[PDB]
Design a protein around this motif. Structure first.
Motif, PDB file in Angstrom:
ATOM      1  N   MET A 168     -12.994  -8.458  -9.074  1.00 39.29           N
ATOM      2  CA  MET A 168     -12.445  -7.365  -8.505  1.00 39.29           C
ATOM      3  C   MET A 168     -11.177  -6.689  -9.059  1.00 39.29           C
ATOM      4  O   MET A 168     -11.402  -5.526  -8.610  1.00 39.29           O
ATOM      5  N   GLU A 206     -12.417  -4.592 -11.673  1.00 33.94           N
ATOM      6  CA  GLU A 206     -13.144  -2.892 -11.505  1.00 33.94           C
ATOM      7  C   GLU A 206     -12.088  -1.817 -10.830  1.00 33.94           C
ATOM      8  O   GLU A 206     -12.373  -0.434 -10.280  1.00 33.94           O
ATOM      9  N   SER A 207     -11.771  -2.832 -10.029  1.00 35.56           N
ATOM     10  CA  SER A 207     -10.351  -1.921  -9.544  1.00 35.56           C
ATOM     11  C   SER A 207      -8.758  -1.559 -10.630  1.00 35.56           C
ATOM     12  O   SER A 207      -8.158  -0.097  -9.659  1.00 35.56           O
ATOM     13  N   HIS A 227      -8.218  -1.038   2.371  1.00 31.79           N
ATOM     14  CA  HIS A 227      -7.214  -1.814   0.791  1.00 31.79           C
ATOM     15  C   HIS A 227      -6.919  -3.337   0.600  1.00 31.79           C
ATOM     16  O   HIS A 227      -5.861  -3.400   0.218  1.00 31.79           O
ATOM     17  N   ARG A 270      -6.000   2.706  -6.297  1.00 37.63           N
ATOM     18  CA  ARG A 270      -5.169   2.034  -6.308  1.00 37.63           C
ATOM     19  C   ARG A 270      -5.777   0.123  -6.289  1.00 37.63           C
ATOM     20  O   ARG A 270      -6.763   0.066  -5.585  1.00 37.63           O
ATOM     21  N   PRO A 271      -4.770  -0.043  -7.357  1.00 43.79           N
ATOM     22  CA  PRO A 271      -5.390  -1.478  -8.314  1.00 43.79           C
ATOM     23  C   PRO A 271      -5.069  -2.650  -7.303  1.00 43.79           C
ATOM     24  O   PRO A 271      -4.283  -1.885  -6.352  1.00 43.79           O
ATOM     25  N   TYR A 272      -5.472  -3.932  -7.699  1.00 45.58           N
ATOM     26  CA  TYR A 272      -4.634  -5.033  -6.773  1.00 45.58           C
ATOM     27  C   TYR A 272      -3.347  -5.132  -7.319  1.00 45.58           C
ATOM     28  O   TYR A 272      -3.662  -4.678  -8.767  1.00 45.58           O
ATOM     29  N   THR A 279      -8.031   2.525 -11.222  1.00 49.68           N
ATOM     30  CA  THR A 279      -8.623   3.296  -9.354  1.00 49.68           C
ATOM     31  C   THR A 279      -6.870   3.814  -9.412  1.00 49.68           C
ATOM     32  O   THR A 279      -5.944   3.215 -10.402  1.00 49.68           O
ATOM     33  N   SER A 314      -4.011  -2.684  -3.498  1.00 53.12           N
ATOM     34  CA  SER A 314      -5.017  -3.515  -3.162  1.00 53.12           C
ATOM     35  C   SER A 314      -4.267  -4.429  -2.714  1.00 53.12           C
ATOM     36  O   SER A 314      -3.707  -5.075  -3.538  1.00 53.12           O
ATOM     37  N   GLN A 367       0.635  -0.521  -0.034  1.00 47.27           N
ATOM     38  CA  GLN A 367       0.402   0.234   0.100  1.00 47.27           C
ATOM     39  C   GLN A 367       0.621   1.119   0.175  1.00 47.27           C
ATOM     40  O   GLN A 367       0.702   2.738   0.018  1.00 47.27           O
TER      41      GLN A 367
END
Length: 211
Positions: free
Chosen positions: A113, A116-117, A91, A122-124, A120, A59, A48
């Motif tokens: 998930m 969708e992220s 997150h 903060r993507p995974y 952003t 994330s 993070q």
């Protein structure tokens, strides 16, 4: 371009070549209490952070098969690392795996998930699977089929979303953990094709893991 997530420990990062790599699966194995779960928790916080602090501004997704996830440990690590514990928890996408089939199923709602992220701030960037084999072991040559398939979906996800995949056990990079003296832990690289097979010492502290 491979991204690296700092473990919290300079000694462990050096042994890993800078940290756990994206588009790869780091497999950490040892007995209970060896640091495998403390390292997963520290990574869910580290990822993070900005790249200058050892993160990827990402994330985390924490798949739990044996009730090892502790939010008050996330809170502590975050507090002691000068982060907001509530923002950090926010997150980290916790999913419990009830069995091996549901565990594999969660890779698909991980994909949903991760899409969708993606667009952003903060993507995974991390997917934790603590532990990889518990449901496979307790449910079952076969089981060996369904296992190396699960590992395939993990690889797809690592390449597909530029994420580091971190799995615990008892692939890409196998790290053997063991308890040391006093409350120190010892890591050892196993069959690494691009890194030397040394050892590193790290501590389990209030900041998660460090030297």
């Amino acid at each position: 371009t491979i991204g690296r997530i700092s473990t919290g420990s300079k000694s462990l990062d050096k042994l890993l070549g800078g940290g756990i790599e994206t588009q790869a699966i780091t497999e950490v194995f040892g007995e209970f209490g060896s640091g495998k779960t403390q390292l997963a928790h520290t990574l869910a916080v580290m990822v993070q952070l900005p790249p200058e602090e050892g993160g990827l501004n990402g994330s985390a997704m924490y798949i739990d098969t044996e009730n090892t996830f502790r939010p008050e440990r996330i809170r502590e690590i975050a507090q002691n690392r000068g982060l907001d514990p509530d923002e950090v928890l926010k997150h980290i996408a916790y999913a419990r795996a009830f069995n091996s089939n549901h565990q594999m199923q969660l890779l698909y709602q991980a994909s949903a998930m991760m899409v969708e992220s993606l667009n952003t701030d903060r993507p995974y960037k991390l997917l934790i699977v603590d532990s990889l084999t518990s449901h496979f072991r307790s449910e079952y040559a076969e089981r060996q089929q369904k296992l190396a398939r699960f590992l395939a979906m993990l690889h797809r996800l690592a390449n597909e979303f530029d994420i580091a995949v971190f799995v615990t056990n008892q692939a890409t990079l196998r790290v053997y953990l063991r308890k040391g003296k006093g409350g120190k832990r010892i890591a050892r690289l196993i069959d690494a094709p691009h890194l030397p097979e040394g050892e590193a010492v790290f501590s389990i502290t209030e900041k998660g893991i460090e030297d």
